[PDB]
């Protein structure tokens, strides 16, 4: 209660980093917020907005999601689970979505990003559902360099609380579309030791991780807690040295003191 705040204080002086905690309890509107304001580089959590664009456009665009691209081996990064078994072959919007992500695949959020035009679309539409903190400035893999006092690709714990549930419980998106998204979230393969692991092993989680320079360890998520009302979740976490090794264990703990009784 007024020991979630002491918990959560003891935790990052534990971790030697900087935390950013919004939970939205959607049961009576209430909070728990710690550094809730504060800026941090979204990374890989920035791919959820991004996804979201796609997603809208599809309400307008009948098929688009079907529309293909070419994979060139020029256009491969630093990360390519999905899109290098592609080289030379097609992909849809779908599927690039889907790749991005469920295993945050860097050459297919870059994809999105050209049919898009650029981040500074993203930023766009993310003013279009009332988010005025969320910025996209650059493309993969730079926007991961994550450099303290940056603000370039960064937004703010309660900011994207806020945007992802609109997202996905809200009416930013139709139906058909908040429904997709949902799927795509509950099917991400990454997040097996962050904000899943501070969970109850029987609830249902939809999550995107991220990581980048400094540490930077992110997660946000959409909480199912068997038959309550959904926990909308933000824990950002990022670190003084520019190396430093990530901390996944440090979200599933600030999870768990957040959740605890819910």
């Known amino acids: 209660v007024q020991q979630v705040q002491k918990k959560l204080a003891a935790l990052e002086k534990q971790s030697g980093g900087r935390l950013g905690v919004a939970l939205i309890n959607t ?52 990360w390519n689970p999905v899109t290098e078994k592609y080289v030379g072959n097609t992909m849809t919007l779908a599927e690039l979505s889907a790749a991005t992500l469920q295993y945050s695949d860097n050459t297919a959020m870059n994809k999105l990003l050209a049919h898009l035009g650029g981040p500074g679309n993203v930023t766009a539409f993310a003013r279009s559902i009332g988010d005025t903190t969320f910025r996209l400035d650059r493309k993969e893999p730079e926007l991961n360099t994550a450099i303290p006092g940056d603000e370039r690709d960064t937004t703010s714990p309660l900011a994207m609380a806020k945007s992802l549930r609109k997202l996905t419980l809200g009416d930013a998106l139709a139906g058909p579309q908040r429904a997709q998204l949902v799927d795509w979230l509950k099917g991400n393969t990454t997040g097996g030791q962050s904000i899943r692991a501070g969970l109850p092993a029987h609830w249902v989680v939809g999550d995107k991780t991220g990581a980048g320079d400094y540490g930077t360890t992110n997660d946000i998520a959409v909480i199912w807690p068997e038959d309550r009302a959904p926990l909308v979740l933000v824990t950002y976490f990022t670190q003084p040295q520019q190396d430093a090794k990530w901390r996944k264990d440090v979200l599933a703990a600030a999870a768990k003191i957040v959740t605890e009784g819910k």
């Open 27 to 78: 049961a009576d509107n209430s909070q728990v917020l710690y550094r809730a304001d504060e800026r941090f580089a979204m990374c890989s959590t920035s791919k959820v907005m991004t996804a979201a664009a796609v997603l809208k456009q599809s309400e307008t665009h009948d098929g688009i999601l079907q529309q293909k691209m070419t994979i060139k081996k020029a256009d491969l990064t630093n």
